[PDB]
Amino acid sequence: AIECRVCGDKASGFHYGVHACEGCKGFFRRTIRLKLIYDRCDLNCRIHKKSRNKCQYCRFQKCLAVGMSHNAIRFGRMPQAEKEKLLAEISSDIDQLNPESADLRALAKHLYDSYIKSFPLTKAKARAILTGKTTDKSPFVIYDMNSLMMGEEVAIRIFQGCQFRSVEAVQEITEYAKSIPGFVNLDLNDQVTLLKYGVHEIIYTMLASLMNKDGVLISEGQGFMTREFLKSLRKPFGDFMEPKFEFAVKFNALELDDSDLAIFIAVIILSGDRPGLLNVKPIEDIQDNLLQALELQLKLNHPESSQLFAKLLQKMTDLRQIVTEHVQLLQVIKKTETDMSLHPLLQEIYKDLY
């Protein structure tokens, strides 16, 4: 679970007297095996997983400061790994991994784990399927009737193809909620309230994980529907998805991992600003401590993301933003159509919602 001293991603071992990744390893050797001079750069560039392939002078320069040496090469085994087997930070784990902070990271880990067992398709999986760096078959693209016809009124087959999903997700979110420190202890009436309003916000957040500017992953992630396709449907259903795509484009820029998504989600289910709540103090209580946990998760995962915590909580007003706007369309449908076979579970949630 070590990282690279130059860029960051997990190292592939001790290359030239230092823990380096496969990329930084071979960059160094290529710069030497070939007299390579990279014109100076006064700016002290930040070398990270992504930026690593931008300023070559700044990348090489840095990795020389980290110790990479041609004369520090070392083969063999790790005789005293036992020494540096305590992640050489277990001394700051009795300092940093505490006091009323050791618990925060303990809460996070708990949720990140409860999240992994609650949902099949995490942002992790989804991004491989999307960046193609996986040992799978490319999702069956669906850009029109022809492709759709190969699934094994159309605007409706698809519309209700979603309503169907929700139901499944709702059952998943539900169990996730029942593992948030103190959610069961709340009065069953607010337990239910917190979800009537939660699920939706939870969905679009998740849903945005499997979305890029061009499309969206469907059916377990073995299928992909083009944005252009959906955008063009029966008069009322064309716009139905744009807002979701717009939101997803913005939300994704923040680059949050499952770890960060896993706490953010809990923060949404626990919002004392929901209508119909009785014991608001209890709820707010859990939230406050969850927010205090998410704030630290972001600082340690994105050391240099300016105001990320603030920006992330802003997306929360855009979620409501969508949801109420969605309900409006869902309202319209009741008129320009007569077959509203909307699932009975969606009925509960949806009816009476602001």
């Binding site: 709702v170 069953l188 337990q191 239910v192 979800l195 509960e348």
Partner: peptide, 10 residues
Amino acid sequence: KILHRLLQDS
């Protein structure tokens, strides 16, 4: 009121 069921069954 259908949710009551998923919150009360684990």
